[PDB]
Enzyme design. Structure first.
Site, short mmCIF file in Angstrom:
data_model
loop_
_atom_site.label_atom_id
_atom_site.label_comp_id
_atom_site.label_asym_id
_atom_site.label_seq_id
_atom_site.Cartn_x
_atom_site.Cartn_y
_atom_site.Cartn_z
N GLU A 172 -8.15 -5.50 -5.32
CA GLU A 172 -7.59 -4.45 -4.48
C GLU A 172 -8.66 -3.62 -3.78
O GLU A 172 -8.48 -3.16 -2.65
CB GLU A 172 -6.69 -3.53 -5.31
CG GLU A 172 -5.44 -4.22 -5.85
CD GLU A 172 -4.43 -4.54 -4.75
OE1 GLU A 172 -4.79 -4.39 -3.55
OE2 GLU A 172 -3.29 -4.94 -5.09
N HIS A 218 -7.33 -6.23 -0.64
CA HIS A 218 -6.15 -5.41 -0.36
C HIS A 218 -5.48 -5.90 0.93
O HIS A 218 -6.12 -6.00 1.98
CB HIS A 218 -6.57 -3.95 -0.19
CG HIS A 218 -5.44 -2.98 -0.20
ND1 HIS A 218 -4.55 -2.89 -1.25
CD2 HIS A 218 -5.06 -2.04 0.69
CE1 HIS A 218 -3.68 -1.93 -1.01
NE2 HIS A 218 -3.96 -1.40 0.16
N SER A 253 0.85 -1.18 0.00
CA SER A 253 0.00 0.00 0.00
C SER A 253 0.90 1.25 0.00
O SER A 253 1.74 1.42 -0.89
CB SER A 253 -0.92 -0.02 1.22
OG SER A 253 -2.16 0.61 0.95
C1 HTQ Z 1 -2.49 3.82 -0.94
N1 HTQ Z 1 -3.65 3.70 0.02
C2 HTQ Z 1 -4.72 2.82 -0.45
C3 HTQ Z 1 -5.67 3.76 -1.27
C4 HTQ Z 1 -5.25 5.20 -0.89
C5 HTQ Z 1 -4.36 4.97 0.34
C6 HTQ Z 1 -5.23 4.78 1.66
C7 HTQ Z 1 -5.80 3.31 1.93
O1 HTQ Z 1 -5.37 2.92 3.27
C8 HTQ Z 1 -5.41 1.64 3.84
O2 HTQ Z 1 -5.82 0.59 3.32
C9 HTQ Z 1 -4.85 1.69 5.25
O3 HTQ Z 1 -4.41 0.37 5.63
C10 HTQ Z 1 -5.90 2.27 6.24
C11 HTQ Z 1 -5.95 3.68 6.46
C12 HTQ Z 1 -6.91 4.23 7.35
C13 HTQ Z 1 -7.81 3.38 8.05
C14 HTQ Z 1 -7.76 1.98 7.84
C15 HTQ Z 1 -6.81 1.43 6.94
C16 HTQ Z 1 -5.37 2.23 0.84
#
Ligand code: HTQ
Ligand code: SIA
Ligand code: SIA
Ligand code: HTQ
Ligand code: HTQ
Ligand code: HTQ
Ligand code: HTQ
Ligand code: HTQ
Ligand code: NAG
Ligand code: NAG
Ligand code: NAG
Ligand code: CL
Lengths: 532, 531, 531
Positions: free
Chosen positions: B333, B446, B200
């Site tokens: 994803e 994802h 990610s």
């Molecule tokens: C490159 N990233 C992908 C798409 C945009 C950015 C944020 C997102 O974040 C996640 O999956 C994090 O693992 C997350 C963030 C905030 C809360 C829960 C989980 C997944």
């Protein structure tokens, strides 16, 4: 067209082209170029530091903030002094160590045009560089104009009398701006080898001070003080400055246990807090209610032992220091309207009598410094001529202008002369068409009236008569020739004699011609009266 | 007996932990400082060398995770973790630490391959402690390092100029890598063989570092899992002054000048800034207000120190780290996790054409699809079935391709054409450790590969034989890559090098090589955006 | 015409004060800075050099005393001061100053021995201005320097690691010594002849400086008056982290990490830390609950800079530049002062063996004696006979020996065995300047030798000829030692060196040599504790 991009030591700066009626080559104008690191946080009350370098191109196209100050007073003065038709409203900020450049040179080729660095006035309490547009002067006289800003009031002059906060921060800002010019002006087509410093009022006094400071040595080659010098007492703090410091700290809600403790507390205070404290102190305002000797008009130049090793009177007495062509001038009525106005002088009558006159002269102690025991003698020497109460008032404003600017300027002028360096003087007498509506029509050569001729106001603002246009043309020629040769004279211009033993000077106005022994009578009267 | 090690700044004491059946114990060190605590003046400034300590520093307790949304941060640590029970974490700006898991015999000299892990979390949340490197360390005999970096406001606030350039978090990643080059040897690791990998945002980080000249000699192989510098959501293009100003205003700061904002923001308590963060509502689908003016993240910028140009311009110049690079993605994803975390309105579990276009627009901050191109997009992906449920799944496919599939492949291709060894994969499996709230039909969601990569089957419970095998394979493929910049090995399905034939490995219950990954999709989007 | 001296940092201006029987006025300089004010970020950091000043600094007014309990401070000042009337002092964190008293004709080129005084006050209170060096300076022709150092939280707060090592006040003491080396010559003193001396915590400081490689060349003779580095109460052993956390919480700070605590405590205002200081009840004895959990008074720690290991380990190590060292104690060290100032439960005037053991146990924070040993301790001292009244006194002799008696001799012996000039003494006299609330039976109480050392009989009034002659003699001995490393001289009883015969001097109305000081006690204790 394709915007001007000059490369400086700390990074590239992008400006803009602006044409001036009558000149093919447009002037490249760069606004808000930082010449030092923002004096924020622990940097408050300390010498200025080098600006951090930046990546990519910096857009120098917006006007910078003006150093924290009374926003009302600040704007009022800006509107009253600006040489442009539309006064630019400015934002307040401690992050104000910027400078504006106006280069008439063709940056595609290498040029070494003479540089003129302007230091704005404002009693060291207010003012800004943006108030002054250098476009006209740059194009007309083909010179690089640089208007700079420096910390004011509490931020730029708070002193404890010791090493914990020497003072003169604003002055150090000025020197730092001069070093920046030394290191970067060539990039803007300027010749670092010919830098001329010039200012009006507190700016004039700053120029007068740098001329006496070792720190400024080799940073400039010619100087011009307009209505303001180092002997203009109100701007220089002689004696123990500890009391003022404490009063400021107390008003700000800080203990005064020790110097370091005071400074540490004032640094923790926010800008808004130090501004409110500034407003409570009522600086730049004639204090009528309270002892005249205790009244504090402003925070100013001190003898810090870094910039100024000793008093100006003592400094100019020596003859073993770097000298440069120095031009000192004054206006006909330095205290005719502007200053009395801004400080709220008790003159809503239009007349004044001997008795009352001795009263104001005393209340004016912070500006003139005339002992209550000499007041009678002084007031008489001026108002004892006529019985007219109205003519008395006029002679009173003459009294004050002489003490504040007249005599101090001639004396400085003389000493510089006796020191073996080219000296020049002038007396500006002309009522500009861009005066205020509230300013009586009988006032000619009021404080700041030469500003409009110096910065070519006639070529930016409307209304200028053909007479006023030519006047400004002539004034810029002199300033620019001076910047160029250290001698204002040039073909097609009235002869300006040097201020040698004959004490020749130039009266500038509708009728510009040379004269002699400027304020000779007054310098002797006061030199004696003060000698007690 | 407690293992002690001399680091450049002093001695550190760790603990020995044995993993099932393994005789050789793994020496674990938790919470080792690699930079000075970025507090006070140091906030919004490049990481600084840590100060040396006098005696033996005890490194047996987990470090706090960088300040973030406590809720979202915990939730993510629970969904992504691979240890048995999730450990509670503390928040602090004092989070510049890294955890070490070394299988090496510290008594003798060793130079095992080092793998440095960069956790994901949109650069907003996340932590290194979430990932236990015990299994991977023992099983593949590599030293595993998990590093932390400043997040959100703290790690990415940018005024667009010298007062606050930004990319603080990426600088922490660099400082962390710097620390590994100077100390890893002492931990049995070979500084001459370092592999960076993350998923990610951590994947995008690896991608960003692979293009940055600052990280030149800090790593020797790179692996980006579900995320690259071309995942537009993570990289802020253009003038960032607007978002800087919005952040300052939200925090009660004047926006007079950059210096003013920075200075004010520094005078704020950690808690006020976290409150500001919560106010901004990042990582959430903003269904109200113009989609073009919603910042779900505070990400990477072209600061001029770490990145001198946009990642795109940097690929063209075939100017970057010519090191073995492995870029892979997962089957779905946008399967469950992300839309679930962003509060995507799909309760019905279906979706018609119109609602799809409307939702795609709101998703602007994630995919950047001009309103005028939304139809072609929606038609290309949904006009094929009248099944509202398939349209809904095809909608998640579209978002997935724009965010990871397409971006990943373009990167690989460019990396390939620059002459460096390249490999790709598409992971398709449903870990048994998936959240019970995630539908059993979502395969390769994802972060689903994380459980194979970090040996979840060996630390958690319930893994079937099939799953256990899958992890063994992935870890070996990964460890082999760190060793040779090539994943192939004896007993492992052949993984063709991603060359002009575009061969890639389809990893799953049934693992086999294939070619032309997202080939048609890349073609479609490259064209659509060419408008 | 006032004294104007030039120093490396600038010019100082003092004042002349004449003393009866001495033609040459003594030049006195008050409040000269030897370090930069330890404010803001400088809190909990080693002292930095003061900034140079541009003209003539006025040094004719007492400086503030380091922040401390204003009441305890003023009280201890009145009790110890040698001047006619105690001088009221101000509190400030800006307290790193020193006062100079030089009898030298500054228009000439004199180089007299220098004696730097380190006041006491449990490292919690005290001031330099308390001690007027006029008499000592004039009488023994030596330059007297009274110094200040950070106290309590400000000078000794420690996290046990690099984020706040501790010993700030000790680093100040050293910095004052450095200053003296660079400037004392311009005050008539000989930089090559500096004697450091002090009492109680000040003595413990001298003792500590003597073992620290940080001062290995800043002095040439040392004198510890009633206090050495073995006086446990002031030196910390074991993990200090808990104390740090307890202080951090009392001040209203998080305790997430060390850096966090230190950072938060730096944000606190002087008043807040003073409020925290008072809430801790540092110099008072807790009669309720388990004694072992009593507030561990702030103190000297093993930081790794000043002290590389415990004092007990540095003396046997024989590792420390050898200089003449004079260690001494007073007859009744726990006679009246220390107990009175700690609010000891002795209003009774009598004490049985039951209350004694209870009280002794309760005294754990001071004597530091295991609970299983209390019976022996008591039995050994009070078991002697009955008369509960005569026992309270044997109880006082008990505390005294454990805090000063035993430690001192032990330290002396180790120094002697290190092959360095060693001298010991026991002061037994009751100054006429004693407090009114002090029992007439108390002779040689804590701090009683200060009046002779600082020539109180020549500043205060009513000194009998006997008391005057005592003061003349002590000063003679001290100054003699300060210039030769040997206290002996013309017109003085012989003071034997503290060699194997363990000869020490008994100072009082009757001054004579004796032997084996506390010898039996040192045996009993060294043993009892061995168990
Ligand atoms: C490159 N990233 C992908 C798409 C945009 C950015 C944020 C997102 O974040 C996640 O999956 C994090 O693992 C997350 C963030 C905030 C809360 C829960 C989980 C997944
Ligand atoms: C890109 C840009 O706007 N540059 C501007 C900068 C920034 O505003 C400050 O650095 C705060 O970011 O400085 C100015 O505003 C200024 O101080 O006069 C002028 C310049 O045009
Ligand atoms: C001796 C000790 O506890 N060291 C630990 C420190 C301290 O807990 C904090 O710095 C607070 O002092 O940091 C960690 O907890 C951490 O955050 O990873 C790990 C490390 O083992
Ligand atoms: C040397 N200065 C003279 C007398 C003292 C000092 C302040 C004053 O200031 C001005 O004329 C400024 O132009 C000003 C300052 C503040 C407000 C309005 C105008 C004029
Ligand atoms: C409206 N004005 C009143 C009466 C007529 C006109 C000029 C006069 O002002 C002066 O003599 C001074 O020039 C002055 C003093 C105070 C304020 C403004 C101007 C005061
Ligand atoms: C009938 N649906 C179930 C329960 C309510 C509704 C939406 C939900 O889906 C999500 O939160 C994800 O957005 C998702 C995951 C897998 C497939 C499609 C969509 C799963
Ligand atoms: C070695 N010292 C003994 C026991 C611990 C330490 C401090 C104490 O107090 C004093 O010496 C001072 O007399 C004092 C300071 C602060 C408060 C009360 C009394 C006496
Ligand atoms: C408040 N105190 C009570 C009555 C007056 C004063 C002295 C006395 O002190 C003692 O019994 C002590 O135990 C002591 C103090 C000083 C010297 C010897 C013994 C008990
Ligand atoms: C610089 O700033 C001005 C005004 O803020 C803006 O109009 C101009 O486009 C900027 N320069 C460029 C082209 O970046
Ligand atoms: C020095 O300080 C003292 C006390 O503050 C003061 O009385 C004296 O006038 C000062 N000396 C000078 C001349 O500065
Ligand atoms: C870690 O070891 C140190 C030193 O032995 C000790 O002070 C600390 O309590 C230990 N922490 C743990 C995890 O018990
Ligand atoms: Cl002015």
């Amino acid at each position: 067209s394709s915007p001007p991009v000059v490369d400086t030591v700390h990074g590239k700066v992008l400006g803009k082209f602006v044409s001036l009626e009558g000149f093919a080559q447009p002037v490249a104008i760069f606004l808000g170029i930082p010449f030092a690191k923002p004096p924020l946080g622990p940097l408050r009350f300390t010498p200025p530091q080098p600006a951090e370098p930046w990546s990519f191109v910096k857009n120098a196209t917006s006007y910078p903030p003006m150093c924290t100050q009374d926003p009302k007073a600040g704007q009022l003065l800006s509107e009253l002094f600006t040489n442009r038709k539309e006064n630019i409203p400015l934002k307040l900020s401690e992050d104000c160590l910027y400078l504006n450049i106006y280069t008439p040179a063709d940056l595609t080729k290498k040029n070494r045009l003479p540089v003129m660095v302007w230091i704005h006035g404002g009693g060291l309490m207010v003012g800004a560089a943006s108030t002054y547009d250098g476009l006209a002067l740059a194009a007309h006289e083909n010179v690089v104009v640089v208007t700079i800003q420096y910390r004011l009031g509490i931020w730029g002059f708070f002193s404890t009398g010791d090493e914990h906060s020497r003072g003169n921060w604003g002055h150090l800002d000025q020197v730092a701006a001069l070093r920046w010019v030394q290191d970067n002006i060539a990039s803007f087509g300027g010749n670092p080898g010919s830098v001329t410093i010039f200012g009006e009022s507190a700016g004039g006094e700053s120029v007068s001070v740098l001329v006496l400071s070792p720190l400024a040595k080799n940073l400039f080659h010619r100087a011009i003080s307009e209505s303001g010098v180092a002997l203009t007492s109100v701007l220089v703090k002689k004696g123990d400055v500890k009391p003022l410091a404490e009063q400021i700290a107390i008003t700000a809600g800080c203990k005064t246990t020790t110097s370091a403790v005071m400074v540490h507390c004032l640094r923790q205070k926010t800008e808004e807090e130090l501004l409110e404290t500034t407003l409570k102190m009522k600086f730049l305002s004639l204090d009528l209610q309270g002892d005249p000797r205790e009244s504090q008009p402003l925070l100013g130049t001190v003898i810090d032992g870094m910039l100024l090793l000793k008093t100006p009177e003592e400094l100019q007495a020596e003859r073993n220091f770097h000298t440069v062509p120095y031009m000192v001038g004054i206006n006909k009525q330095e205290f005719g309207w502007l200053i009395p106005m801004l400080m709220s002088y008790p003159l809503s009558e239009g007349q004044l009598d001997q008795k009352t006159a001795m009263s104001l002269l005393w209340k004016s102690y912070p500006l003139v410094c005339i002992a209550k025991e000499l007041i009678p003698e002084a007031t008489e020497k001026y108002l004892g001529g006529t019985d007219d109460t109205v003519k008395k008032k006029d002679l009173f404003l003459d009294l004050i202008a002489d003490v504040m600017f007249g005599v101090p300027s001639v004396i400085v002028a003389r000493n510089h002369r006796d020191a073996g360096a080219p000296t020049y003087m002038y007396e500006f007498q002309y009522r500009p068409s861009f005066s205020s509506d509230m300013k009586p029509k009988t006032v000619i050569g009021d404080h700041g009236d030469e500003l409009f001729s110096v910065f070519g106001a006639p070529f930016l603002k409307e209304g200028a008569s053909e007479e006023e246009i030519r006047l400004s043309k002539m004034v810029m020629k002199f300033w620019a020739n001076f910047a160029r040769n250290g001698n204002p004279n040039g073909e097609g211009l009235p002869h300006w004699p040097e201020y040698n033993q004959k004490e020749g000077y130039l009266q500038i106005g509708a009728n510009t011609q040379a004269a002699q022994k400027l304020k000779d009578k007054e310098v002797a009267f006061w030199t004696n009266l003060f000698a007690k």
